[PDB]
Design an enzyme around this catalytic site. Structure first.
Site, PDB file in Angstrom:
ATOM      1  N   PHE A 294      22.125 -11.022 -48.912  1.00  8.99           N
ATOM      2  CA  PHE A 294      21.745 -10.528 -47.582  1.00  8.99           C
ATOM      3  C   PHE A 294      20.573 -11.336 -47.019  1.00  8.99           C
ATOM      4  O   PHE A 294      19.405 -10.873 -46.976  1.00  8.99           O
ATOM      5  CB  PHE A 294      21.496  -9.010 -47.609  1.00  8.99           C
ATOM      6  CG  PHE A 294      22.288  -8.300 -48.671  1.00  8.99           C
ATOM      7  CD1 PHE A 294      21.652  -7.527 -49.641  1.00  8.99           C
ATOM      8  CD2 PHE A 294      23.671  -8.455 -48.735  1.00  8.99           C
ATOM      9  CE1 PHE A 294      22.380  -6.887 -50.635  1.00  8.99           C
ATOM     10  CE2 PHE A 294      24.410  -7.827 -49.726  1.00  8.99           C
ATOM     11  CZ  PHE A 294      23.759  -7.036 -50.680  1.00  8.99           C
TER      12      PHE A 294
ATOM     13  N   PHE B 178      22.034 -16.267 -49.972  1.00  7.84           N
ATOM     14  CA  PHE B 178      21.747 -15.294 -51.036  1.00  7.84           C
ATOM     15  C   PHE B 178      22.059 -13.863 -50.630  1.00  7.84           C
ATOM     16  O   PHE B 178      22.601 -13.641 -49.546  1.00  7.84           O
ATOM     17  CB  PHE B 178      20.295 -15.413 -51.530  1.00  7.84           C
ATOM     18  CG  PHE B 178      19.259 -15.271 -50.447  1.00  7.84           C
ATOM     19  CD1 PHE B 178      18.855 -14.009 -50.008  1.00  7.84           C
ATOM     20  CD2 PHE B 178      18.665 -16.405 -49.882  1.00  7.84           C
ATOM     21  CE1 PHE B 178      17.887 -13.882 -49.001  1.00  7.84           C
ATOM     22  CE2 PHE B 178      17.697 -16.295 -48.878  1.00  7.84           C
ATOM     23  CZ  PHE B 178      17.304 -15.035 -48.434  1.00  7.84           C
TER      24      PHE B 178
HETATM   25 CU1  CUA Z   1      27.084 -12.937 -47.754  1.00  3.54          CU
HETATM   26 CU2  CUA Z   1      28.315 -10.813 -46.558  1.00  3.54          CU
END
Ligand code: CUA
Ligand code: HAS
Ligand code: HEM
Ligand SMILES: [Cu+2]
Ligand SMILES: [Xe]
Ligand SMILES: [Xe]
Ligand SMILES: [Xe]
Lengths: 166, 554, 33
Positions: free
Chosen positions: A86, A84
């Site tokens: 970060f 997702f």
């Molecule tokens: Cu996922 Cu950069």
């Protein structure tokens, strides 16, 4: 001279090309060799596995982090990973070495990369699609997942962790 | 100018050139900073104080990508692959259209520049969905690209016209190349045309809310790979038919060159999966079939390697070339337009080695999305293609403007050339090392200095290069503008015929070239290959479309 | 004049530069297998 060279060049060009194609066909069989082995697992599954990206962490195998790891064979362990914005789910993944870990990775937002540092697991994580890779860790420790696909301004900071189990 | 009235194509070409180079300049400024960043130093504050409108690392990469790899290259190709076949044929291209193509290119760039300069378009030159950019980017780019379609017509028009004035005659070499080229590019551009028309344009205008990101990056790479050859062949064109004259020799075979180009027309488009190895939902088998065809499309560049070396060898020998390596020292290392490309071809060897590896399916999983790939291509595009572009100024610029080149500019260039090549070499080493060291590309890693401690030594090479190439770019600019800014005009050298190479031909050639000149057949041949390689896949994908909503992540 | 010594020495470096790269990374594939 000049017309003497022309037949000399067009004669080692014919011998260069033969050699070229022989050398490439040796790569083909040494690629056709890696396809029959246990190493050919990290190849993403070919059959389409559609998912909705907007109801993945609400309903289904990716809703509850806790049920991430599930024994599905005597020595097989299907992890459900969720790449997702970060970050990764579960963090950390925890699986025994020597076992056949069959990851099934997707995304709720944009495209992500799933690169396990030191392994051959390098797959593209696509929103609405499940990315299914088979691997067997034969070394213990903490394996680092890096997101190799630009996924926004926090992309250089998106890292994971797979503690295989010693 | 009675020069431009008699050769109006000259003017159109020039505009293409300048616009291109202008684009190369601006896009290149971010290169040193991106190199320093990959040496673990964060020079971006300074960049931001100088260039205020710059909002991040990623906006400058987009601008880097787009202006250099996209704008510059396309414009150059449009300039080369039209002007050269014209002059060879000594025929005037449809100037209405030709001028039309330029404006499109111009206009297109403008419209697309704004939302890029306005941080409305921080998506990268690949613009993968679901990352959503401003409509005027996607509309801008479309126009700009379509400009090539015009160029394809123009060239085909010339070709049909000449075949009429010479019934039964084999298409002259360069014109043959240009022809195959543009056809090849037509076929290649579909993939992208589709994406934009079906998904991107209506997406950005509001008409849909979602676009399947897989089918999006599938169509993109249909085009995404061949375009690199859309970048390459214009340089190949020059190397085959112009460099041997520069070197003091001849092209050693007309058939060979025809063959190379013919293979590219056949094997360029149907290999895009090599860019999608790491992708899900694409059969592994079709990834193998595409991996085979990609190793095949390297065959053309294998042939070129020999053919050009032999010609250069041949050239060195006519100059007073000694033994195994004498010929090399016999070459005109004093002449930029010789030096520039020859250097590029040197760095190409590592480049093309890099590509053969990336193409081996399973082996991709070692270097995918790592800084090994920027290393691979900077040898390819940023080195060979650009140098070629640069060095060709020395015969081309004069051939268009009439403005002669002083010895001082001539040595200025030789410096620019060497530095650029050298610096390219350093970085090539500095991005390949860190690549195998799992450093991902497309990364602002100077904002996270302690993330990659094992890339200590390569980080240094990247630094070095950054500097090297910062200097080289500067001198270029100075060298560049010195030339374009002078009011020395020798209207005789503008009219001087282009320094094309002579061609050593053989007895066998006739029947072979005659086969190759079966263009309409080879075209449909090439058209069939793409259908067979993409067809199967794209059917299932359009059967199971799963569009997702757009995101702004800057 | 005679055999393209120069050009065949070029294609040599090339083919060697090819094997280094291809075998060098073909082992890292199995060393990460
Ligand atoms: Cu996922 Cu950069
Ligand atoms: C113009 C620019 C480019 C050229 C040319 C190019 C060539 C190849 N590439 Fe590539 N490429 C890949 C495979 C190949 C292969 C097999 C070739 C071949 O065409 C190369 C064959 C070349 C040779 C086999 C060398 C011939 C050498 C010659 C001809 C020089 C001889 C020198 C002489 C004779 C001089 C001697 C003189 C003296 C004086 C000594 C693959 C994988 O299959 C990827 C995906 C990687 C990934 O996962 O991201 C890829 C990725 C890229 C990307 C990244 C795109 C992105 O942003 O995602 C770019 C920009 C790019 C450009 C270019 N690429 N490529
Ligand atoms: C001034 C000299 C240049 C330097 C020092 C330089 C340096 C770099 C570096 C370090 C990267 C990697 C960025 C990253 O991974 O974050 C990069 C990317 C790139 N370069 Fe250059 N570059 C230069 C000029 C050029 C030229 C002339 C071209 C082609 C015409 C070019 C094409 C590209 C492309 C297409 C990318 C990838 C952009 C992206 O992924 O969005 N560059 N450059
Ligand atoms: Cu490619
Ligand atoms: Xe553009
Ligand atoms: Xe576009
Ligand atoms: Xe590209």
């Amino acid at each position: 001279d000049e017309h003497k060279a022309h037949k000399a060049i067009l004669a080692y060009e014919k011998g260069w090309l033969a050699f070229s194609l022989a050398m490439l066909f040796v790569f083909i069989a040494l690629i056709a060799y890696t396809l029959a082995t246990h190493t050919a697992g990290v190849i993403p599954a070919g059959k389409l596995e559609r998912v909705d990206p907007t109801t993945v962490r609400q309903e289904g195998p990716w809703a509850d982090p806790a049920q991430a790891v599930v024994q599905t064979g005597p020595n097989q362990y299907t992890v459900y990973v969720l790449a997702f914005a970060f970050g990764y789910q579960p963090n950390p993944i925890e699986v025994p070495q020597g076992a056949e870990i069959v990851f099934k990775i997707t995304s709720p937002d944009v495209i992500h990369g799933f690169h396990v540092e030191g392994t051959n697991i390098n797959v593209e994580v696509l929103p609405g699609e499940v990315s299914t890779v088979r691997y067997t860790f034969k070394r213990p420790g903490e394996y680092r997942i890096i997101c190799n696909q630009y996924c926004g301004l926090g992309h250089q900071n998106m890292f994971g962790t797979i503690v295989v189990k010693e | 100018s009675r020069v431009y009235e008699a050769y109006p194509e000259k003017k159109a070409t020039l505009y293409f050139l300048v616009l291109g180079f202008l684009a190369l300049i601006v896009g290149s400024l971010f290169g040193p900073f991106q190199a320093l960043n990959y040496g673990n130093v964060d020079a971006y504050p300074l960049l931001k104080r100088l260039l205020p409108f710059v909002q991040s690392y990623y906006q400058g990469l987009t601008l880097h990508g787009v202006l250099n790899a996209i704008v510059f290259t396309q414009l150059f190709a449009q300039a080369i692959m039209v002007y050269l076949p014209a002059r060879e044929l000594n025929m005037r291209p449809n100037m209405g259209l030709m001028w039309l193509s330029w404006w499109m290119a111009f206009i297109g760039l403008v419209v697309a520049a704004l939302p890029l300069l306005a941080n409305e378009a921080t998506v990268l030159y690949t613009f993968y969905p679901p990352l959503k950019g401003h409509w005027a980017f996607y509309l801008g780019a479309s126009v700009f690209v379509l400009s090539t379609w015009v160029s394809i017509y123009i060239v085909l028009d010339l070709w049909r016209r000449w075949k009429a004035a010479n019934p039964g005659k084999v298409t002259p070499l360069v014109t043959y190349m240009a022809v195959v080229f543009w056809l090849m590019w037509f076929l290649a551009s579909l993939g992208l045309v589709l994406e934009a028309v079906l998904f991107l344009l209506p997406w950005s205008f509001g008409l849909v809310e979602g676009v399947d990101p897989l089918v999006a990056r599938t169509l993109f790479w249909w085009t995404g790979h061949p375009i690199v050859y859309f970048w390459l062949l214009p340089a190949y064109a020059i190397i085959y038919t112009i460099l041997p004259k520069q070197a003091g020799g001849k092209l050693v075979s007309d058939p060979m060159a025809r063959l190379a180009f013919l293979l590219f027309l056949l094997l360029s488009t149907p290999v895009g999966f090599h860019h999608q190895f790491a992708d899900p939902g694409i059969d592994p088998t079709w990834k193998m079939i595409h991996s085979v065809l990609t190793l095949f499309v390297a065959v053309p560049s294998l042939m070129t390697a020999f053919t050009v070396a032999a010609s250069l060898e041949f050239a060195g020998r006519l100059r007073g070339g000694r033994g195994l390596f004498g010929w090399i020292r016999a070459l005109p290392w004093d002449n930029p337009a010789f030096v520039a490309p020859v250097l590029g071809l040197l760095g190409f060897i590592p480049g093309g080695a890099g590509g053969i590896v990336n193409a081996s399916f399973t082996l991709d999983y070692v270097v995918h999305n790592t800084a090994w790939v920027p290393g691979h291509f900077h040898l390819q595009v940023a080195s060979l293609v650009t140098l070629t572009a640069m060095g060709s100024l020395y015969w081309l610029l004069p051939n268009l403007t009439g403005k002669p080149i002083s010895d001082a500019q001539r040595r200025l260039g030789l410096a620019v050339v060497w530095l650029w090549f050298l610096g390219m070499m350093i970085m090539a080493v500095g991005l390949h090392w860190a690549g195998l060291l799992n450093v991902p590309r497309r990364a602002y890693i100077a904002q996270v200095p302690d993330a990659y401690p094992h890339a200590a030594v390569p980080m240094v090479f990247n630094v070095l290069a950054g500097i090297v190439l910062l200097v080289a770019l500067l001198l270029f600019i100075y060298g560049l503008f010195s030339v374009l800014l002078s009011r020395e005009r020798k209207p005789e050298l503008a009219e001087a015929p282009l320094p094309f190479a002579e061609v050593i031909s053989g007895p066998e050639d006739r029947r072979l070239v005659l086969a190759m000149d079966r263009i309409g057949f080879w075209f449909a041949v090439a058209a069939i290959l793409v259908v067979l390689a993409y067809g199967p896949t794209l059917v299932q994908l359009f059967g199971h479309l799963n569009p997702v909503p757009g995101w702004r992540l800057w | 004049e005679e055999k393209p010594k120069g050009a065949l020495a070029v294609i040599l470096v090339l083919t060697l530069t090819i094997l280094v790269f291809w075998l060098g990374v073909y082992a890292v594939f199995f060393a990460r297998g």
